[model samples]
Target: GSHMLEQKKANIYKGKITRIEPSLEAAFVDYGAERHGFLPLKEIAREYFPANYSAHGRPNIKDVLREGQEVIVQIDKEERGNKGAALTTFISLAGS
Candidate 1:
């Protein structure tokens, strides 16, 4: 006899960025996880826009992000030793 098990699989998370803290090297993005995720500024985006497009003519997460802001992100990795979970803004729905 074959039986089906109904279980919920781990899926990507989509929520607002509750907090953002900049460090000397890396920045933290709170994705409502048990522990906040780490996002290096260098890992943010590849495309750079002009000053007119942005308040500053440089690639800086601080200038673009803030606490309690709505964002769409996906979980790429789980937390590891001395490393928080990895996240990505580039995401797609399960069905999509």
Candidate 2:
């Protein structure tokens, strides 16, 4: 048994975007862990993107989040492969 949800359960947190991997459509976020969390491009909503972009297709990750950006995210899954926690922007909180 370990603390920090043992990397099994999920947690809501604010993290910083350490790096963006355009090829993978995912960004590496520093969630105060040895391994940085992985944020998928699809998980980032258009509202977070620069201005009101009209042109459509698949939105670029770079346009959604800037380098070294901070984001409030929730862990979707434990670390797998070579990535850390899977991050999502659809956050839900309890209590006030």
> Can you tell me which runs of candidate 1 are displaced by over 4 Å?
1-10, 25-27, 45-52, 55-58, 92-96
Among all windows of ten consecutive residues in candidate 2, which has the lowest summed lDDT?
1-10
What are the models' TM-scores?
A: 0.54, 0.68
Runs in model 2 lying further than 4 Å from the true structure? 1-10, 50-58, 80-83, 92-96
Write candidate 1's Cα lDDT for 1-96 as tens digits. Answer: 111321243355444455555654344556557776655555554321222353333356665455554444455667775666776545431121
Model 1 per-residue lDDT at 75: 50
Model 2 RMSD in angstroms: 6.4
Best by TM-score: 2
Clash totals for all candidate models: 0, 0
lDDT of each: 0.49, 0.67
